[PDB]
Amino acid sequence: SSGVRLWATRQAMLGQVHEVPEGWLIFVAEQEELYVRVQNGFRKVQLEARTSTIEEQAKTFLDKFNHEAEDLFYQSSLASWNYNTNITEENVQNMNNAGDKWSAFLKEQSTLAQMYPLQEIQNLTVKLQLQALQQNGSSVLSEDKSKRLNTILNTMSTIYSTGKVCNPDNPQECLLLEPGLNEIMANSLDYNERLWAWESWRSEVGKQLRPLYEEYVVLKNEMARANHYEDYGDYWRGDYEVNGVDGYDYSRGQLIEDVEHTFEEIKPLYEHLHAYVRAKLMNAYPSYISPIGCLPAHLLGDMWGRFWTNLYSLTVPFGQKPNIDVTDAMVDQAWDAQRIFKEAEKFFVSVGLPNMTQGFWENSMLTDPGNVQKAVCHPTAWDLGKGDFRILMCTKVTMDDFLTAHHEMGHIQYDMAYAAQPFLLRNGANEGFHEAVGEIMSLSAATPKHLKSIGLLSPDFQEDNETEINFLLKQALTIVGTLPFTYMLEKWRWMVFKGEIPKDQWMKKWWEMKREIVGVVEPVPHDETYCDPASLFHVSNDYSFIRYYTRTLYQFQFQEALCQAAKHEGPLHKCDISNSTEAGQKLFNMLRLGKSEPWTLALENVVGAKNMNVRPLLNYFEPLFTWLKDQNKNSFVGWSTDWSPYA
Amino acid sequence: SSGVRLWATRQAMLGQVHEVPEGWLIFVAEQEELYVRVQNGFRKVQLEARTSTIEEQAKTFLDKFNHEAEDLFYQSSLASWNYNTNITEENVQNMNNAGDKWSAFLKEQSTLAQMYPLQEIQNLTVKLQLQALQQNGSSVLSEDKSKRLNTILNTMSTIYSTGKVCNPDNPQECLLLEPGLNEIMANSLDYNERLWAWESWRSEVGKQLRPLYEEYVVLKNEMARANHYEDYGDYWRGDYEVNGVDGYDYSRGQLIEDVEHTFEEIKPLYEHLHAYVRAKLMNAYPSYISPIGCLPAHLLGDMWGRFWTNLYSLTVPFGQKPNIDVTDAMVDQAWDAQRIFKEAEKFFVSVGLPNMTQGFWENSMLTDPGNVQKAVCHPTAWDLGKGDFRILMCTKVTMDDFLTAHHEMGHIQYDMAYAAQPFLLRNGANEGFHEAVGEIMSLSAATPKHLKSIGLLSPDFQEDNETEINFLLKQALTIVGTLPFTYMLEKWRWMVFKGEIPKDQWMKKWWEMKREIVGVVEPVPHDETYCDPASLFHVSNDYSFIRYYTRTLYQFQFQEALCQAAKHEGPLHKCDISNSTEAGQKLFNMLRLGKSEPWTLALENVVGAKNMNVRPLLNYFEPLFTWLKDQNKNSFVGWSTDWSPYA
Amino acid sequence: SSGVRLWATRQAMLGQVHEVPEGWLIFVAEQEELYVRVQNGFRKVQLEARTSTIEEQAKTFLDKFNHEAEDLFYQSSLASWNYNTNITEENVQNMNNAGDKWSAFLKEQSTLAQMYPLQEIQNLTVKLQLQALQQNGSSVLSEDKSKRLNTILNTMSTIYSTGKVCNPDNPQECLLLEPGLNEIMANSLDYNERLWAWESWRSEVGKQLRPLYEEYVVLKNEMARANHYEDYGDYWRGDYEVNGVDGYDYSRGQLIEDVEHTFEEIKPLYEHLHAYVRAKLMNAYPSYISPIGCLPAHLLGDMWGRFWTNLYSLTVPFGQKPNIDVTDAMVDQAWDAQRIFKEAEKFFVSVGLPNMTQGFWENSMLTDPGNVQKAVCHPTAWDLGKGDFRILMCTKVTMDDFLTAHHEMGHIQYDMAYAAQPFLLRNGANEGFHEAVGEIMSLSAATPKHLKSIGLLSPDFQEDNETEINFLLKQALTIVGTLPFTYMLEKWRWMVFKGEIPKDQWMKKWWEMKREIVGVVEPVPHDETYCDPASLFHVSNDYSFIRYYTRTLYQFQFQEALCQAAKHEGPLHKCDISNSTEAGQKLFNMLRLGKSEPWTLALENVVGAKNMNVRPLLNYFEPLFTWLKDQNKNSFVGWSTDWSPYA
16 A cells, blocks of 8 residues: 555645545646655655656557548538538538548548557557447448448438428328428317328338338347447447446446436426326316326427427416517527627637637538528538537527527537547547537527616516416426436337337337326327337437437536536526626536546536436426426326327 | 565564565665565665655544544543642532533544544554544434433442441441441451441442342443444453454453463362361351351451451461561661652653653642541542643552552553553553553562662562462462452343343352352341442443453463563562563553554463463462362362351 | 556567557566557657665575675686686686585575575565575485485496507507597497497496496486476476466476477478488498488497588488588688687677677687686687686687687576576576577677688688588587477486386387487487486486477577577578668666566567577578488488398
8 A cells, every 4th residue: 555645636635635645646737746644644755846558658649540530520621511511412422521531531541450469558548539439330340240231221211310200181181290291290289280290201111111120120139239339229338338437437237327326216297297287187178188188299398209398388487478588589680690600709708718710700600501502401510620610500590599599609618618528539428418508508599688788678577477378388298298208218128129128019008008107098099010219310310319318418418517607596597697707617517528537537527426417407397396286186196008090 | 577575674584584575575664764675684775865534534534533532531631630639629520520521522533533433544553542432432323321320320429439338236326338347357356347248238238229220220231232343341351351353352252261261270179268268267157157158258358358458467377477568677677659750750661661741740639638638548649731740649658558659650651651542542551551650660669679679678588488378478468369259240240231141130149159269258248239240439430340350360470470570589479570670661661552452462462362361370389289279188179169157 | 447457578469469458558567668559559758867574585585695695606616717718727726616616605695595495575576586495406315315325426437538458459549538439429420439339338338337327317216306306307307397477377287298399390391401411321331321211320420429510421312512611711811710709709799799808808718728727618608707707718710619619608698687686596507508508609600601701711702502501401410400309308308217128128219219310319228227328418417308308399499589680581590680770789687587577478578479499490501401301302301210231
């Protein structure tokens, strides 16, 4: 013993001096002060002034790769932005060529990185970067298995994107999922029209995708075994996995544990929320919604019941008190996309974050990019590299565009935060961190205190409890509404990749937890021909939906840390972090690392805990929970799986 | 590789450097010097210039307690001292009121100290001080149990004090134990007179204290059992218990066997001593002590048979030969108690111990201040605190009081010696150290060498073996004689606390142990109605009687070590530590430590033996041991338990 | 937090410097230097000039021994040198008298060493010294057992030296082993005379040697068993044993494994070598040796078959191609013995090794000093100690003596290299390391480039490939041919010491391995009455013979390492080390270690491998192996044990 016992600050040393054993060096990492642990305290130690292995070759190989990678990635990034801004055939070709150049280049380095054995490589950053490169992808399988898996992904993504259903009343009248079916599942309130749209989408897509999905899963599973995973779920569980880090290693199975462990705390709030929606639905559809039965899968505000936000019309806590809107004030104050972005930039400056790049304005587009060029209006950030930061969207004078602008800007702030890190580390620690950071900025941007501070919300405006309940429930519909849907679906892919559910029970098991975990009942029964669990975008397009679940746990914890940092006074849903420079600095310390460090370390450095939890959400919706329990003390609370609209 | 080991002191590492492997850095916590262990020596590495937790709160909690504890204890000691030296109603009020507030102060800080656990404390001193504070004692039980236990002790204290037995000849003529009954069996040699007083007290006290003793023992055990002890004997055995110290841990059960083992090897010396007393008692009581039977209880020169000092008149080795006493020379030089205490002060400066403050002398009652105010003449020490010291003794100009002055001042020097220790640690290592220090110096003072040096004894005094045996036997009767009685009484009390001796067999086993361990048999058959063991002041008032046996073992070890350090030659009873400055410095090494260190470490450093032993006892009385065998060859050696004066 | 990392040796530091993080202070005990670790390298920190127990007693006792031992050994060496240079009765006594006094000094020092145990020494060098002196060896037995070993050892030595066999035709014509019997089997090619010489020697001398060798074997086993060995074979294996060194321990049992493992790898080379010699023996003895059976024992060029170079007259690959001979140039250039050593001195200077000092020329004779005083013409290297190194040889103007002087020069330079060690540690690592140094110097002196550089080889000479084959086969007969003989003899001597085979099969086992391991069958069967295993000098003189097998393994490894530094291109046997200073410095570092450091580390330092390996042996004779396989593909390869000339 009597070795190196080093920590960050002297305050840690004062609290841990009794912990440090006799003879152990007390080195303060931040203060660069060295002390020796002696009898009842520490003594000052004299310090002087600050001054071919394969691992050395790997460092040369890795850095050399970066310079090539930076250039080629920029070409692919630019080709994408040009194609995204203007969808033309020429824009496609360069995107293909740059992507083909980029993809081919990466595998050569991937194979070359695999030539380096990581066991003899001890640098934490270097070893992580190499394995981040040594990943061979689908090439770990055979080419034909890679060919099948990729082509199916091309087809499955195409089928979901091109999934179009036709009503039996008119064969020629066919409506896509968007905007045809989704508007019907959200805006239309007809029992049959929503039932048909829900049924037809899962019929013409699920039946076609089910054979493709069956082969897709095993292809994804066998590569996971080829990549040393129990299933492709564990392959996606390796994304949050932390290995080799003392005090921060995160096992893949722990991801399943934490998601289920945190989900059980959401059930009581959700159950009363589920009962209240059932209580409100039975006020609108008493026949279609039983007081004890589950909520029909076609009356949930969207195709799959993913979000209950569109049910706010039928489940409004207080019709006389609408949600706080300052979009008209923006119209009154003549605010527009550049103004909103400038206000967002000012808000980011308000929390101490640096002002965003001016080159963004020259390069990125905010409003609708006309019609000659073809572009997507969805909020999309663009960290093209080499200091090139952009956001591609059509921003109008609306809160949603205002909030998503904050959501997208936070990504860019995160993008430049880890831009100092190498290209391999130039990304978020996990898939949900950047999105979670984007959300909390929008949430703070949506705070009425911020709106009142900036003048969007008038000073004489009052935030009554009914409005807060209206706000919280709308938050619950958006956030807590999708949590059970996210929890089961990701867990569904977990067991499907693990093969727990046999082919002849994928649909039956889906409806088993639909009515039980989520309390959602299919209006008409579906069999294994249907592939409704894969009918969503992420499952069809092979995206781990856990990102939404993880970020929601992260964002509330981060916001809770923000509220603690900003010293919020009031309801947690009213927590505004405006004019809180220190919180941005603390957030910057997390964001500056990006993915250079384990996400558990970053999570603890912000919220104080190395594990995600839903404790802020319970605090966030605590007044709402009491109101929901008060509203549900009369109506039945829970859900009966046996009941169904078809029986 | 290599390791670094730190030393508190440079000299400890210098003597522990050869076994250190080469390459280990040599660092000392005091000199802060850098050395590297190299081949056959060490190279001095050049060094540059010098550049919450419960335990820290625990350290601060103790220090604040020490300030108020030192103040209130000083007032309590002062108030009690006034009552002793001046026995008046108001002085009694001061002694009671100050003690009550001190008692109230002790429990309040003890309760507050309970919120400072001992396990997380790294400092043994900090943990030990709180452990003394956190000792709930009788309060671990319910409040009624403590009150009734004190009620028994109050009744035990009053009854023992007021125990008066009336002579059958005159019912009005009644005598208390002190000084009436004690003088009967110490001065009067009439067997019947001693027998009546011995039986009357044990009958009167026994019939009223036996039922109280049964309950008092149970109450003492129950709190000990709740205080994690097997019995109240183990509760008292925790005084010598050592825990948490490497190389010096002492267990409570180790105390039992050490006292037993030490006494067993004393028996061959004691059996000859018992035989000679038995042989000499026949010369005065031919029909009352058998040549093989055990000694009569009241024929031992004292009340309980504890001290055989008065038997020296009847069992003198050579009555014609004089005894070591310069009491006449004390008054031939026109001295007094003040000069006697001055000689006691001269004794400490002769052995090298520093002189004490004059404040002690001006506050100490060395002689009774007349008769208008009553001064308690019971020898005691007063470590009042804040450097205040007093001696409660009506010392006169006599050799007997000359040793008493040395004995009491020995406690005072010891009490001030560990003043550097905290108030909780301002005490002796155990209950047999301060008495040991004062006894050995008095014995050294009583030697002819000390008396001749200061002119108390003429140099023409004949230091022949005739006076050597007479002095040894008188010391043996006082010191060696009380060891068998002290050992059994604590052993008997231990089994009563442990419940081993049946309640209907306490009296028989007490005398059976007296018959066997001590070779002393009661003159009248006492049943369990009697409470002869509790007739002692210590047993009734709940005083651990093992302190005297340990003190006797410690003092001889202390004395022999001083004589060995002073290069004493010849019989050990003539050893004088006067004019030996090294002996006091050697003695003072433990005296400053006090009770912070284990007593085993204290005993080993002073003497050389970690545990107790009887080797100094054999060295002190070796001429007597051979002399006893010469006188005891004509009579039985040992004792016979069956014989009794009543049968 | 960097801290300090310490290495005892540079090799440990360099081998571990890669894993040292930047900024770590690095200290090397051997170099007494400070280093600061940086990226992909280390930076040295400059320094100024260097600044009771049994361990202390042992160092003093050993240090005083070395100086005294050097003198007495030098006196014994001085007298022995005079005895060998001058064969006179006076010189015989001086060698014995100085030797006896020196031997008595070792015995006295050994007695004083036995009280200094090795385990209590914290200095590795000090512990090793007493180990080599505390070895009682033959003295662990009784005086009579030691006495009876000495007489038989000399008796079997004298009988071997005075092996007298007389021709049956002429009783008075008796030829001794040297030069009579040896020349018969070396120069004379008559099968019958060699058959008689081999048979008569092993018959008359074998009968006399057998009781002496068997008794000597048992006694050598008895002492070794009492010396903590399984047998006397293990006693000799203890010289090569290394224990207690991390990464360098060598066990005695592994020596048996390594010898057997290496010999199996040499079998493919030897089977073709045996086949070709068998093919060539048929060209001269078609009626005695078959193409399938083994070889006659006397048809190996010697009675024991140790040296097969005498067969080169009948087994030459090409009788017309000249070998590497420069004796003509030596005579033409008027060279003598002094020029040979001077040319050896020039070669050693060119390679960087130090030149021979003044004491060599002034004290060491180089030619036989006429008939006035007889000089032992056997070439011996005389390390008399205390700066006295001498070479004894009857060197003539010949190429053979030119190599032999280099052989003695290698030993002399080997001896002086480890002079920095104490006298006890001033010895070779084992019994095969030192002999390897001499042979390679002769091999280096035999290289064509060295002769050409010094003018011995005419530059106009053409080095044909066939000449290389003849050179390699001639070298193979001397060295590669002797490997099977050394393996079986040591394996047989392992059995006789360990007693794995009863005495009635010792000779049967000796020829069994001759038929199988060596592929050589005795022309006349021999029973246990003979002592053919002891017919060699070392077996008949209590000398291990495995030292030469280790010598062969070490010398080629040494030869490979020297060419590795020289970076020679082409055949290994054509490599030269002239004008290669870096090779000599590394070689001298190998020679300066002596026995103070493990030979496994020394073998690692020179080459890189800590275990035995036969790659240099195959590399040196790589053209020879292909030539033998090409020539022996038309003939039977291997041997048949059953076949015999007498059967």
